[PDB]
Amino acid sequence: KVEGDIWALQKDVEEFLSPLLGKTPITQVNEVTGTLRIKGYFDEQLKAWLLEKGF
Amino acid sequence: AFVRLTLPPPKVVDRWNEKRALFGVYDNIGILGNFEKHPKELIKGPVWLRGWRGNELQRCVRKKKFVGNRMFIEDLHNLNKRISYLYKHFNRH
Amino acid sequence: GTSLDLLRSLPRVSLANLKPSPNSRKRERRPRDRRRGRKHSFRHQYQPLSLRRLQYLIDLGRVDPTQPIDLTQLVNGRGVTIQPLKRDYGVQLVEEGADTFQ
Amino acid sequence: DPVLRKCELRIPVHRRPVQAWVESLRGFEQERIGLAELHPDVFATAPRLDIVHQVAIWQRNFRRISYANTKTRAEVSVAHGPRGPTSYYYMLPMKVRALGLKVALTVKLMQDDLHIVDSLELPTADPQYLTELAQYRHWGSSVLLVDLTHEEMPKNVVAATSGLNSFNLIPAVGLNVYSMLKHQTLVLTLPSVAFLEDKLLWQDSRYTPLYPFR
Amino acid sequence: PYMTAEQECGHAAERRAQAFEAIKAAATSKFPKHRYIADQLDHLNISKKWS
Amino acid sequence: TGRGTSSRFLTSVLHNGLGRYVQQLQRLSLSLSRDAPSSRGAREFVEREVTD
RNA sequence: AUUAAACCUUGUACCUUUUGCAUAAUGAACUAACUAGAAAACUUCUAACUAAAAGAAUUACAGCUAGAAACCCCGAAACCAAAC
Incomplete structure (x- = not known):
């Protein structure tokens, strides 16, 4: 359930996960469905990071 | 082979006739009708396949059950023989 | 929603214009040409409710804390699924959430 | 005096309301x-x-029966010929069909093909008036008129639309x-929009049913 | 032979290691491709016509 | 194919380039449809490149 | 190829089958029509919704629903029932 500029989210998501993951995350963007696919499990870090944004 | 030596007459078809114009109307009866009537209930046709679909053997077997008592004796015997071939083909090959 | 704006610029859609999503439908092979030419019941089946599963219902307010817990109410809230065809005979609890349900 | 309508259900705070001209x-x-x-x-x-x-494919194909x-x-x-009556019936989930209806509504509004109206009542029952009015407002050659319920639809509109093939x-x-795709423009009464919104918005918290909702 | 066995040893070791590292990156780059709304939206231009 | 097909010798129309080159093409005719995907490219060509 | 139809130069009919070979071996007077690949248990792919999913009967500690995705033809010697 991503709304707005997906590219802006991807840039921030890529930046946030690059240090934690150690390299740029491998991701696939399904713009038609408005979803982002990421290899590996990083829900806990992303969920906490989303809370920081205020979502 | 050989081909016609005369041209067929031109034909004009109306695409906005009531049947074409109203095709698909009330297809949302369930969602817009509180789901009281399922769209499957709107199917009109052979009794054994109203709201139901299956393979040829299933369709034939269901047909026999629905109208077996009301079918002709000759037709029933033919249907029984036909069912045998269908059963073996799908269930053994 | 810039996508909506593009629709206004784009021409009016028609029935013929509709096209299936990419990769939604695979191709098929037909014999038109040479391509396909040539060749235990007695033991109760207890359905348990986890303490963690119990905790969120109260915390989410799905089940009223004042009202005593009722298995029928849980079914009313779709908390648990019981199938007569499965012949479920009992209800249990799951150790999960022992440390998270105060 | 402008006719001001607000959504009965709670619009999301992060989402601004969609607005259109009442006619x-x-x-x-x-x-x-x-x-x-x-x-x-x-x-x-x-x-x-x-x-x-x-x-649209489902609509065309769930009614398809070949005899x-x-x-x-x-x-x-015939080695491989048609074999008796054959049907192609299948069912889409109610969630998808409701979503498909939701998607269609947006396209018509964004393409300026949807016209929200207070009521269908017409001063005259002449079919000519409806066609002329569509030309007056530059509506498409085909206009679809929707009312809240069939029983209460005005008699004057019935005569005009009944005699018109494209309307x-x-x-x-x-x-x-x-019907929406076949018709260039869509005319919806205000009560119908609320009726459609209620059913479409009902999909929220779609309890998987163990029995019919009734 | 101009170069003795001592000269040969280790002269090209650095390049060989780098070449494999590039090979590793290319090998482990399998992933699906992204999907864009513009592709679906642009399809409606197929219906464009003159007034 | 050569046996079954015609052939000619190298030649010039009227020694076109001896004094001054003359373009052989003299007339172009274009048919278009207002509502046709096939002619859209030609229709777009008319807007932009036909004048040039 | 040619100025020129024939001359000059080059070239061991076709399908099937043998083995990736026939100077083997099968089959063809010719024309027109007719004449043989059919299934979803699981998976990938395409989407909906999601600790829930399916319009009753189904599965679930990310699952669940929908769609698409598959496997020919002709031909024995025989055998049996009931009539004639």
């Missing part, structure tokens, strides 16, 4: 009489035309994707 069919120049708010979750859904494409039959070599007193009159429950 009336009483007079030729009554193009705009009010401003109405439309739920973003209904009238601002993503334009997923494959769902609409799938729904072709032929006698094979064994039945001669079809349907009730709220009769709305379907194929």
Whole structure:
């Protein structure tokens, strides 16, 4: 359930996960469905990071 | 082979006739009708396949059950023989 | 929603214009040409409710804390699924959430 | 006095309401009489035309029944010929069909093919008036008229639409994707929009049913 | 032979290691491709016509 | 194919380039449809490149 | 190729089958028509919704629903029942 500029989210998501993951995350963007696919499990870090944004 | 030596007459078809114009109307009866009537209930046709679909053997077997008592004796015997071939083909090959 | 704006610029859609999503439908092979030419019941089946599963219902307010817990109410809230065809005979609890349900 | 409508259900805070010009069919120049708010979750859904494409295929194909039959070599007193009555019936999930209807509504509004009206009532029953009014407002050659319920639809509108092949009159429950696509522009009464929104917005918290909702 | 066995040893070791590292990156780059709304939306231009 | 097909010798129309080159093409005719995907490219060509 | 139809130069009919070979071996007077690949248990792919999913009967500690995705033809010696 991503709304707005997906590219802006991807840039921030890529930046946030690059240090934690150690390299740029491998991701696939399904713009038609408005979803982002990421290899590996990083829900806990992303969920906490989303809370920081205020979502 | 050989081909016609005369041209067929031109034909004009109306695409906005009531049947074409109203095709698909009330297809949302369930969602817009509180789901009281399922769209499957709107199917009109052979009794054994109203709201139901299956393979040829299933369709034939269901047909026999629905109208077996009301079918002709000759037709029933033919249907029984036909069912045998269908059963073996799908269930053994 | 810039996508909506593009629709206004784009021409009016028609029935013929509709096209299936990419990769939604695979191709098929037909014999038109040479391509396909040539060749235990007695033991109760207890359905348990986890303490963690119990905790969120109260915390989410799905089940009223004042009202005593009722298995029928849980079914009313779709908390648990019981199938007569499965012949479920009992209800249990799951150790999960022992440390998270105060 | 503008006719001001607000969505009965709670619009999301992060989503702004969708708005359109309220119209009336009483007079030729009554193009705009009010401003109405439309739920973003209904009238601002993503334009997923494959769902609409799938729904249109479903509409064409779930009613498809072929009665072709032929006698094979064994039945001669065709190796692969049609074999009796054959049907192609299948069912889409109610969630998808509701979503497909939601997608279609946005496209018509964004393409300026949807015209929200207070009521269908017409000063005269002459079919000429409806056609002329459509030309007056530059509506498409085909205009679809939707009312809240079939029983209460005005007599004057019935006569005008009944005699017009390209202008079809349907009730709220009769709305379907194929009719919307076949008709260049859509005319909806304000009560119908609320009726459609309620059913479409009902999908929220879609309890998987163990029995019919009734 | 101009170069003795001592000269040969280790002269090209650095390049060989780098070449494999590039090979490793290319090998482990399998992933699906992204999907864009513009592709679906641009399809409607197929219906464009003159007034 | 050569046996079954015609052939000619190298030649010039009227020694076109001896004094001054003359373009052989003299007339172009274009048919278009207002509402046709097939002619859209030609229709777009008319807007932009036909004048040039 | 040619100025030129024939001359000059080059070239061991076709399908099937043998083995990736026939100077083997099968089959063809010719024309027109007719004449043989059919299934979803699981998976990938395409989407909906999601600790829930399916319009009753189904599965679930990310699952669940929908769609698409598959496997020919002709031909024995025989055998049996009931009439004639």
